[PDB]
Design a binder for this molecule. Structure first.
Ligand SMILES: S=c1[nH]c2cc(Cl)ccc2o1
Length: 156
């Protein structure tokens, strides 16, 4: 898709010029070794001073051929403990749904910062996994304890 590919080239140029520190966002390759702008390997650092500090959380971003009409699918690999991350790893966030708050102008940087903000502030009206949601609701201290253990697990 020429429209998608031209936008994704724009996004990559902008990302490389200015991105938030500690974040990664890199296109993958096709079986012939050429660049695949439709599938990016990304990583989000935990925010300092939070329970997520020191973790680096790997995420795949998958673009459909009609991008930027549609948002990318954003999937933690491996899946994470968080109330708004499905067991598959897929992120549930309103800016990431075409029929909710996605707008074509939203950039990859905005998406990744939006997901980082989600990590430290769950949306309890919108749960995506039972376990993290239940613990978040029942015992915030235990929730934080689990988040810290996960961040350690995913430290570089
Ligand atoms: S290494 C390594 N593998 C990987 C996969 C994804 Cl989806 C994102 C970041 C990654 O870093």
């Amino acid at each position: 898709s020429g429209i998608a590919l031209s936008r994704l080239a724009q996004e990559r140029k902008a990302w490389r010029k200015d991105h938030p520190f500690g974040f990664v966002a890199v296109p993958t390759k096709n079986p012939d070794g050429t660049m695949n702008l439709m599938n990016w390997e990304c990583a989000i650092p935990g925010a300092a001073g939070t329970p997520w500090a020191g973790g680096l959380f790997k995420l795949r971003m998958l673009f459909k051929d009609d991008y930027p009409s549609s948002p990318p699918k954003c999937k933690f690999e491996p899946p994470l403990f968080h109330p708004n991350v499905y067991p598959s790893g897929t992120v549930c966030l309103s800016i990431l749904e075409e029929d909710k708050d996605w707008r074509p102008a939203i950039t990859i940087k905005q998406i990744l910062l939006g997901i980082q903000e989600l990590l430290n502030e769950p949306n309890i009206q919108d749960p995506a996994q039972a376990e993290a949601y239940t613990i978040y609701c029942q015992n915030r201290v235990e929730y934080e304890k689990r988040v810290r253990a996960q961040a350690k697990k995913f430290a570089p």
